[PDB]
């Protein structure tokens, strides 16, 4: 189950821009400590890893980590079982895994001075934000409160430290520049399928509207819904009657209509309440966010699309967290992804 | 195929680090976003580790440790897309570990809710960062004497400058002790192994070896900081500008320094390091004096009974290497010299 035969593997950087400091560079003057004087800095570039099997069949898969994550989540589970990278190379697909700008091996744009500041210009904010272990525990639905598990949980218990260690902050790079890097990658790859997660859900939808090479999307628990501009439906507040889900992203209808031209599947795990749950903010947030996505998919289908919501419990898989692809039953989750690819001919040459 | 690789297994994991906490208690009924430090536990300073194991490995696993401002990418591929040392050594029948050290790449960057690096009133890392420019890296890496220029003999993959410089970035002010600690923990997990280091990780790998008997050999590509027994640093001249000095050598207690005499150690240097003072080119002159300091460090290990050597790539018949010989155009020939070192010491046999 662990063996993999690669025709080739490697990694590269793509996307990004440059910014420049003031003045000139004199190679005769001390280079350390480093200075912005005469400086060119490459910023906002993305890291890309690829592994290609012998005799690939179908389109390459581009696995795009969720918020605060890296391509690690597709390589291995926290307890060291094979991730989707290995499983899909074994399923005969070329597999690309990225670290988006601002995350992991992607660029974090900072210079000589306060974080993110190039002289007078703020490239990214000096003040950061970052979830705690406790916030991630409830966001990911391991259980209703930190340290508590749902009885049915598929989480690899005992490997909590390993799991939370994979998460971190993201600097305030604009979403436009993140989308731009992935559009450039899709242009480089050719026809492909995006497999997204959480924060990369809305970003992958945007990429597809800019890149006809995206031939399908599977999004694991996307975090932000998308609608045509001016056509956001009524979405309730949370059960606390004060909080809202993430403001839906709005795009011009001419771009939104491109989503109707490819198969799209959103995949949700378990333990999302059907009814308001004021005691558990993130559980209630997932209830309303899932509802908003159901409306987003319906809007795509009213434009002639083929956009579906797969609830893993309906497929017979119980207890999945917000990371179904690293849960204990991730092989069965992968089988459902192979099923989607096969139905839509994305596993054939 | 030159690109074909057969893995018995591959994967990645996190190791090392500690936790820090914010004040107060976490209430799951209160809005979790925007993120707060209240009731928070944060995992900080952990390291990312990737491994690829061949079918039936022969000899010790290799741990490739990137230089300053880099990541494990530099061992995966060259800027122009040729195989890196990860592929070459898996093909050479060694299990290969590649790390992103704490503060770099997939390793943790310790920041929270607040100004960068600050957890309430505690400064975990500095808010003010430092980072080289393209121009600083060009001369540090000896592509040529000035940005845009290449040495006549250059092995750099010319035309792929954008790819190359895009791989570099800043490092937060994590203590070197905590970086060493994470790698010591990895070495405990792996068992007997060989460290292959680069630039900034040179001195760190020497330190790891003094804390971890499982390090059975070191190959260091152009280490940046020299190491000596405490209060035994030899006289080292200032640079030709009569103002600058090399990096202050690291000093360790002699009982730890002596551990370096028990294992084979090779430092590898590329080309275009001047023999004589060069006041017009600061980094070239810096490399001249830094290489000299390393020659004295290796001599101090040998005087204690060690097995330390300096491999100048031009003396081995390889001309034009930069500060990254393992991604240069002749990196296959550089790899053959690493295989030679491993074979000489039996580190390629079980
Ligand atoms: C791994 O799971 C997630 O990606 C994820 C999933 C659900 C909620 C939060 C996150 S996240 O915090 O970690 N990433 C994210 O999308 N956060 C976010 N993004 C935007 C654009 N705005 C706001 O605040 C309004 N928060
Ligand atoms: C890949 O090349 C190198 O690794 C490398 C190579 C040559 C010089 C410098 C570096 S470095 O940029 O990372 N720095 C390093 O080794 N640590 C460090 N950094 C600074 C800024 N100051 C001091 O001490 C004053 N030490």
Task: Pull the structure tokens for residue A134.
Answer: 């406790």
Rg (CA), chain B: 21
Residue ID of nearest Cα to ligand 2 atom 15 = B200
Q: Which of A8, A80, A6, A126 is CA-nearest to residue A326?
A: A80
Between CA A107 and CA A116 the distance in angstroms is 12
Enumerate residues lining ligand 1, CB below 6 A: A 66-69, 131, 139, 198-199, 223, 246; B 33
Q: Which of A276, A204, A273, A274 is CA-nearest to residue A240?
A: A276
Between CA B50 and CA B99 the distance in angstroms is 6
> Which residue in the block uniquely carries the two structure tokens 């704490």?
B102
Q: B199: Cβ below 6 Å to ligand 2?
A: yes
- Contacts by A84-89, CB closer than 8 A, 24 or more apart: A84/A195, A84/A325, A84/A330, A84/A334, A84/A337, A85/A51, A86/A2, A86/A4, A86/B10, A86/B11, A87/A330, A87/A331, A87/A334, A88/A61, A88/A334, A88/A337, A89/A4, A89/A6, A89/A51, A89/A52, A89/A53
Q: B140: Cβ below 6 Å to ligand 2?
A: yes
Exposure on the CB side of residue B46, measured as CA atoms within 13 A: 21
Look at B40 and A12 and tell me if their CB atoms are within 8 Å: no
How far lies A282's CA from each of A145, A206, A209, B41, B228, in Å? 10, 25, 30, 18, 54
Mode of pairing for the β-strands spanning A214-220 and A263-268: parallel
Cα(first)–Cα(last) distance of chain B, in Å?
26
Number of domains in chain A: 1
CB atoms within 10 A of CB A314: 9
Secondary structure (DSSP) of B217-276: EEEEES-SS-EEETT-PPP-PPPTTSS---PPPEEE-HHHHGGGGGSEEEEEE-S---SS
Q: Which residue of B has its CA nearest to A29?
A: B282
CB-based contact A238:A288 (threshold 8 Å): yes
The domain of A94 spans 1-349
Between CA A111 and CA B133 the distance in angstroms is 8
Interface test with A, best of B1, B130, B284 (most A CBs within 10 A): B130
Look at A146 and B3 and tell me if their CB atoms are within 8 Å: no
Give the SS3 label for residue A243.
Answer: coil
Exposure on the CB side of residue B251, measured as CA atoms within 13 A: 7
User: DSSP secondary-structure letter at A102?
Assistant: T
Q: After which residues is chain A broken (C to N over 2.5 A)?
A: none
Look at A104 and B106 and tell me if their CB atoms are within 8 Å: yes
Between CA B236 and CA B290 the distance in angstroms is 9
CB-based contact B98:B75 (threshold 8 Å): yes
> Which residue in the block uniquely carries the two structure tokens 């662990």?
A2
Contacts of A40 in chain B (CB under 8 A): 133-135
Question: Residue B114: which of A13, A47, A127 has the nearest Cβ?
Answer: A127
Question: Residue A27: which of B10, B116, B282 has the nearest Cβ?
Answer: B282
Q: B126 burial class (0-12, 13-18, 19+ CB within 10 angstroms)?
A: middle
Between CA B238 and CA A112 the distance in angstroms is 25
Task: Pull the structure tokens for residue A277.
Answer: 């749950």
Between CA A28 and CA B276 the distance in angstroms is 15
Look at B77 and A12 and tell me if their CB atoms are within 8 Å: yes
How far lies A220's CA from each of A282, A317, B42, B47, B174, in Å? 17, 14, 25, 26, 34
Task: Pull the structure tokens for residue A248.
Answer: 């839906």
Cα torsion A280, B42, A321, A214 to 10°: value is 120
Give the SS3 label for residue B64.
Answer: strand
This structure was determined by X-ray
> Which residue in the block uniquely carries the two structure tokens 């218990």?
A157
Give the SS3 label for residue A258.
Answer: helix
Produce one character per residue of B7-45: b if its CB has 16 or more CB atoms within 10 Å, e if not: bebbbbbbbbbeebebeeebebeeebbebbbbbbbbbbb
Between CA B153 and CA B325 the distance in angstroms is 13
Between CA B331 and CA A121 the distance in angstroms is 40
Contacts of B115 in chain A (CB under 8 A): 114-115, 126-128
Task: Pull the structure tokens for residue B191.
Answer: 């068992």
Rg (CA), chain A: 21
Between CA B49 and CA B224 the distance in angstroms is 23
Q: Which of A220, A138, A224 is CA-nearest to residue A178?
A: A224
Residue ID of nearest Cα to ligand 1 atom 9 = A223
Secondary structure (DSSP) of B159-219: T-HHHHHHT--------HHHHHHHHHHHHHHH-SEEEEEETHHHHHHHHHHHH-TTEEEEE
Look at B139 and A27 and tell me if their CB atoms are within 8 Å: yes
Task: Pull the structure tokens for residue B62.
Answer: 């290799």
Q: Which of B169, B199, B273 to mutate to test the pocket of ligand 2 (most atoms within 8 A of CB)?
A: B199
Q: A120 burial class (0-12, 13-18, 19+ CB within 10 angstroms)?
A: exposed
Q: B220: Cβ below 6 Å to ligand 2?
A: no
Q: Tell me how close the Cα of A76 comes to any Cα of chain B, in angstroms.
A: 5
Between CA A170 and CA A217 the distance in angstroms is 24
CB atoms within 10 A of CB B297: 28
CB-based contact B172:B101 (threshold 8 Å): no
How far lies B348's CA from each of A322, B89, B190, in Å? 43, 10, 16
Task: Pull the structure tokens for residue B290.
Answer: 């830094």
Mode of pairing for the β-strands spanning B128-129 and A61-63: unpaired
Give the SS3 label for residue A315.
Answer: helix
Q: Which of B109, B107, B87 is CA-nearest to residue B96?
A: B87
Produce one character per residue of A161-197: b if its CB has 16 or more CB atoms within 10 Å, e if not: ebbbbbbbbbbebeeebbbbbbbbbbeebeebbbbbb
Residues in contact with A9: Cβ distance below 8 Å, sequence separation at least 6, in sequence order: A49, A50, A51, A52, B3, B5, B76, B87
Residues in contact with A273: Cβ distance below 8 Å, sequence separation at least 6, in sequence order: A280, A283, A284, A286, A287
From the CA of B34, how far away is ligand 1's center (Å)? 9
Residues in contact with A156: Cβ distance below 8 Å, sequence separation at least 6, in sequence order: A77, A78, A79, A81, A163, A326, A327, A328
Q: Tell me how close the Cα of A281 comes to any Cα of chain B, in angstroms.
A: 5
Residue ID of nearest Cα to ligand 2 atom 23 = B247
Q: A234 burial class (0-12, 13-18, 19+ CB within 10 angstroms)?
A: exposed
Between CA B42 and CA A310 the distance in angstroms is 33
Which atom number of ligand 2 is nearest to the Cα of residue B66?
1
Between CA B222 and CA B197 the distance in angstroms is 9
CB-based contact A223:A199 (threshold 8 Å): yes
Instruction: Dihedral sign for Cα B197, B200, B201, B206, please.
Output: positive
CB-based contact B159:B325 (threshold 8 Å): no
Between CA B76 and CA B81 the distance in angstroms is 9
Q: Tell me how close the Cα of A304 comes to any Cα of chain B, in angstroms.
A: 35
Which atom number of ligand 1 is nearest to the Cα of residue A68?
13
Interface test with A, best of B32, B137, B272 (most A CBs within 10 A): B32
Between CA A284 and CA A157 the distance in angstroms is 24
Q: B68: Cβ below 6 Å to ligand 2?
A: yes
Cα(first)–Cα(last) distance of chain A, in Å?
25
From the CA of B224, how far away is ligand 2's center (Å)? 6
Look at A39 and B241 and tell me if their CB atoms are within 8 Å: no
């Amino acid at each position: 189950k662990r063996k993999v035969v690669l025709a080739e593997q490697g990694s590269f950087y793509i996307g990004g821009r440059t910014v420049t400091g003031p003045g000139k560079f004199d190679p005769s003057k001390p280079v350390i400590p480093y200075s912005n004087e005469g400086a060119t800095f490459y910023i906002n570039q993305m890291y890309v890893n690829f592994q290609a099997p012998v005799r690939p069949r179908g389109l390459p898969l581009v696995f795009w980590h969720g918020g605060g994550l890296t391509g690690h989540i597709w390589e291995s589970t926290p307890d060291g079982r094979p991730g989707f990278q290995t499983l899909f190379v074994q399923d005969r697909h070329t597999v690309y895994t990225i670290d988006q700008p601002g995350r992991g091996r992607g660029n974090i744009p900072t210079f000589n001075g306060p974080f993110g500041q190039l002289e007078e210009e703020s490239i990214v904010n000096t003040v950061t934000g970052n979830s705690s272990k406790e916030g991630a525990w409830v966001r990911d639905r391991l259980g209703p409160a930190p340290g508590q598990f749902f009885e049915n949980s598929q989480f690899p218990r005992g490997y909590e430290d390993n799991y939370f260690k994979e998460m971190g902050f993201s600097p305030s790079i604009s979403s436009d520049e993140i989308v731009d890097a992935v559009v450039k990658l899709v242009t480089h790859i050719g026809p492909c399928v995006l497999v997204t997660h959480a924060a990369s859900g809305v970003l992958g939808m945007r990429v597809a509207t800019h890149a006809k090479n995206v031939r399908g999307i599977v999004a694991y628990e996307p975090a932000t819904s998308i609608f045509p501009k001016g056509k956001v439906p009524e979405i309730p507040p949370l059960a606390d009657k004060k909080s809202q889900i993430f403001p839906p992203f709005e795009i011009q209808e001419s771009y939104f209509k491109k989503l109707a031209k490819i198969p799209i599947q959103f995949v949700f795990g378990d333990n999302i309440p059907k009814n308001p749950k004021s005691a558990y903010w993130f559980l209630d947030w997932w209830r309303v966010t899932r509802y908003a996505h159901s409306l987003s998919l319906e809007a795509i289908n009213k434009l002639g699309g083929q956009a579906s919501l797969l609830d893993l419990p309906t497929a017979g898989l119980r207890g999945n967290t917000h990371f179904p692809f690293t849960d204990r039953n991730n092989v069965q989750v992968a089988s459902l992804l192979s099923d989607f690819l096969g139905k839509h001919g994305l596993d054939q040459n």
